[PDB]
């Protein structure tokens, strides 16, 4: 007869959800001392990490049920709040803010975009008040009834904390690592769409390195797809699910704030500094975002060709600009050089495709205007507004796209020109574009099985 055998170290696993350990590269900690991510994920990784053979094992993956995305969201939220926590409070700014236009070498576009404001501010001596002046963008300032009196928007909802100017929020690789007794299964199937079986399944202890980049409409840095274009929706036909397009070829972006900006230091109180935006040196122009037109329309053609596989083969496909709503979602928000950009993406999209070629279209470059606001309410929080300090000089950024977020407009039940718009993706989408292929699994080393051998007694 056959007898029970208890094996320890059995290579089996279950689909568990646990805490993960973040760890940057060593060089990220050697330099960039004040970087928030290098400081938090300071524990160095393996300089030469090893992966594991495929082992002829298939495994089911589901990115939209992946708890790693929730872990990253909670971690970055906590890290952000804890980084802003020691920095100074700007409660004294919630005062009647007397403002005028700027009218200093302002092009036609930026008329009214900047405002020269002044106010009574506290000093180290609480009984002595100092009149000071600063420069505010119109998006951060709202009128009171009605040279003219205004207020900050944050003072209408919540007290605002100044970000510490020394702290850098630049993205770096993170390499989310599993704790002991856990492992991360990586899916290497080319053109793996999501929510399915995967065959080229490796096992690792840390992820390939994810930049925690913040952008709403378009992703900006990350991993390019292996081949062609990939479409990833939990339910394509649901019409309330984002589409998460990923590109095999990057798309160059030249972002810039051209104003030669200067910083003005005011003393709030004991050991407390407020960093106002001083007078702009020279002339003024709105922030630009340049995209290579040839590359852009080629990429859109590729996206249309890939989209036609999930829909009818002859379905006319229409790209329209985003609908109305909050500025966080109606535009392309992102962080560049410590400043915040909000770019109107109506310049992109705005086309129809009937025969795999742009109906409206046909070296050149598409220019997207961008507004800038200092007072941020990140992560769509209600309170906990943050005041981004100004950055002196001019600002340049070289970015890629590496996928974009689209939402399908349901419209009617009959499919003439099924429309796609820039999806107001939540940040979970931004990181789920990267944390797919990855599944966290607990190891259950103990198991039982029958044998021919009996214990000797």
């Amino acid at each position: 007869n056959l007898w029970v055998t208890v094996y320890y170290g059995v290579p089996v696993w279950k689909d568990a959800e646990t805490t993960l350990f973040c760890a940057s590269d060593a060089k990220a900690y050697e330099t960039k001392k004040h970087n928030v991510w290098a400081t938090h994920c300071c524990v160095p990784t393996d300089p030469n990490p090893q992966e594991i053979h495929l082992e002829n094992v298939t495994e089911e993956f589901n990115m939209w049920k992946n708890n790693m995305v929730e872990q990253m969201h909670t971690d970055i939220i906590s890290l952000w709040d804890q980084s802003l926590k020691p920095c100074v409070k700007l409660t004294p700014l919630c005062v009647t803010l007397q403002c005028t236009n700027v009218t200093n070498n302002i092009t036609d576009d930026m008329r009214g975009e900047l405002k020269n404001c002044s106010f009574n501010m506290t000093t180290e001596l609480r009984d002595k008040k100092q009149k000071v002046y600063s420069l505010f963008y119109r998006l951060d300032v709202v009128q009171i009834n009605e040279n003219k009196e205004y207020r900050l928007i944050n003072c209408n909802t919540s007290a605002i904390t100044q970000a510490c100017p020394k702290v850098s929020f630049e993205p770096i690789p993170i390499h989310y690592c599993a704790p002991a007794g856990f492992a991360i299964l990586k899916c290497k199937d080319k053109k793996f769409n999501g929510t399915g079986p995967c065959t080229n399944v490796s096992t690792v202890q840390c992820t390939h390195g994810i930049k925690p980049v913040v952008s709403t409409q378009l992703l900006l840095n990350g991993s390019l797809a292996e081949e062609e274009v990939i479409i990833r929706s939990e339910n394509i036909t649901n019409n309330a699910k984002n589409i998460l397009v990923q590109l095999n070829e990057s798309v160059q972006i030249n972002c810039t704030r051209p104003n030669n900006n200067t910083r003005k230091s005011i003393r709030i109180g004991p050991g407390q500094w407020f960093y106002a935006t001083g007078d702009i040196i020279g002339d003024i122009r709105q922030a630009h975002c340049n995209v290579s037109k040839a590359t852009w329309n080629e990429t859109l053609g590729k996206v249309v060709k890939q989209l036609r596989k999930h829909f009818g083969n002859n379905t006319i496909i229409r790209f329209a600009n985003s609908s109305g709503g909050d500025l966080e979602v109606t535009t392309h928000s992102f962080n560049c050089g410590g400043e915040f950009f909000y770019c109107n993406t109506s310049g992109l999209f705005n086309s129809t495709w009937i025969s795999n070629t742009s109906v409206q279209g046909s070296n050149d470059s598409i220019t997207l205007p961008c507004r800038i606001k200092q007072i941020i309410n990140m992560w769509q929080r209600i309170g906990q507004a943050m005041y981004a300090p100004p950055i002196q000089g001019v600002i340049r950024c070289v970015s890629n796209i590496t996928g974009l977020i689209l939402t399908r407009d349901g419209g009617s039940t009959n499919s003439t020109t099924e429309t796609f718009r820039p999806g107001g993706g939540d940040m979970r989408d931004n990181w789920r574009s990267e944390l797919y292929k990855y599944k966290v699994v607990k190891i259950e080393p103990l198991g039982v099985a029958p044998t021919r051998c009996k214990r000797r007694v």
Binding site: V4, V6, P11, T19, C42, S78, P179, A180, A449, P450
Partner: protein, 144 residues
């Protein structure tokens, strides 16, 4: 080799590489702490972050608790200090009706674990009884 020594490759040969799976359950904890230790001026910011400190402390404590659970559960079955141990509980065809060649080849460990999941607790209970009886019998043999 590696963390998973041909995991899911086959039920039979996979049992020939068990020491790495056994060692990882604390080797990972110790090596993670070693990685933290070699990086000074790291513990201060993490310690000031009370939430993160409690998170990783809970992670380490849970890992140790699972390892201790497994070791105690092996000790109760009279298998402490052995990765492979045979017992005196006969196998039941109710749990699985396959022969040895059917399972020790032409099957993977994960598939086998799925095949006998529902009865697992029952088997554990039986094992407990066995050890107790054996220990009592040993006392009788020491009385003689």
């Amino acid at each position: 080799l590696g963390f998973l020594g041909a995991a899911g490759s086959t039920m039979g040969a996979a049992s020939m590489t068990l020491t790495v799976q056994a060692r990882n359950l604390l080797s990972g904890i110790v090596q993670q702490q070693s990685n933290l230790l070699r990086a000074p001026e790291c513990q201060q910011h993490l310690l000031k972050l009370t939430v993160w400190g409690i998170k990783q402390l809970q992670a380490r404590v849970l890992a140790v608790e699972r390892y201790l659970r497994d070791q105690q559960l092996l000790g109760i079955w009279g298998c402490s200090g052995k990765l492979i141990c045979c017992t005196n509980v006969p196998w039941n065809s109710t749990w699985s009706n396959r022969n040895l060649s059917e399972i020790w080849d032409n099957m993977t460990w994960l598939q086998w674990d799925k095949e006998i999941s529902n009865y697992t607790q029952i088997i554990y209970g039986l094992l407990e009884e066995s050890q107790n009886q054996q220990e009592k019998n040993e006392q009788d043999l020491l009385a003689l």
